[PDB]
Amino acid sequence: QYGSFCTQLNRALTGIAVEQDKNTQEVFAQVKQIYKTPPIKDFGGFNFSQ
Amino acid sequence: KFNGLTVLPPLLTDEMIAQYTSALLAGTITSGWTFGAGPALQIPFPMQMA
Amino acid sequence: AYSNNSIAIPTNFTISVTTEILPVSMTKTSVDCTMYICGDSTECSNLLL
Numbered sequence: 267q268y269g270s271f272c273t274q275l276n277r278a279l280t281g282i283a284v285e286q287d288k289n290t291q292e293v294f295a296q297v298k299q300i301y302k303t304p305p306i307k308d309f310g311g312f313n314f315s316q
Numbered sequence: 317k318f319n320g321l322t323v324l325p326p327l328l329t330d331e332m333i334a335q336y337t338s339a340l341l342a343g344t345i346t347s348g349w350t351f352g353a354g355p356a357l358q359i360p361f362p363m364q365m366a
Numbered sequence: 367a368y369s370n371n372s373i374a375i376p377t378n379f380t381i382s383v384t385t386e387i388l389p390v391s392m393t394k395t396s397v398d399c400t401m402y403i404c405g406d407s408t409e410c411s412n413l414l415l
């Protein structure tokens with residue numbers, strides 16, 4: 267009988283949970299494919315091994 | 317893990333977000349920005365700095 | 367692959383238009399305690415004040 271105070275917290279709280287998935291999806295998902303570095307890694311001096 | 321409290325994992329596992337990071341690093345050194353603006357291209361890195 | 371003396375120059379172009387959606391305003395609303403918490407009630411209105 268206290269009302270819908272219970273649900274509003276749950277539904278509102280879940281919004282942040284779904285929000286996090288949308289945050290990461292729009293940060294790292296910037297390419298429509300997958301790229302692999304070439305086997306030989308001669309880059310004219312630069313070392314990317316780090 | 318207390319009462320009524322729970323935690324859900326991120327959308328992308330760290331083992332997977334590394335996949336996006338690997339692709340972006342692999343695509344940036346082998347195709348400059350060309351992969352972002354269209355298909356990736358073979359522009360070698362030593363001259364890409366130029 | 368890679369090559370010290372290699373290049374890449376586009377020989378053609380394609381014009382593209384993309385749509386970006388941005389909200390600029392939301393429905394403005396106003397609420398009144400004198401009518402919300404208490405409805406045309408003298409005793410309730412007196413208690414509220």
Ligand SMILES: *[C@@H]1O[C@H](CO)[C@@H](O[C@@H]2O[C@H](CO)[C@@H](O)[C@H](O)[C@H]2NC(C)=O)[C@H](O)[C@H]1NC(C)=O
Pocket residue numbers: 311312313315
């Ligand atoms: C990795 O980057 C560094 C940049 O200098 C280089 O690795 C060095 O290689 C020399 C040659 O044996 C070593 O004495 C150094 O200890 C290495 N590290 C550093 C920090 O100097 C190299 O250009 C790149 N390639 C490799 C395989 O390390």
Ligand SMILES: *[C@@H]1O[C@H](CO)[C@@H](O)[C@H](O)[C@H]1NC(C)=O
Pocket residue numbers: 369370371
């Ligand atoms: C690039 O590397 C090749 C090795 O195949 C070398 O012959 C060439 O001289 C290098 N370019 C420059 C500008 O040093």
Ligand SMILES: *[C@@H]1O[C@H](CO)[C@@H](O)[C@H](O)[C@H]1NC(C)=O
Pocket residue numbers: 377378379
């Ligand atoms: C560029 O691409 C368009 C695509 O239809 C084509 O009609 C045009 O002939 C191309 N330009 C050249 C110089 O090939």
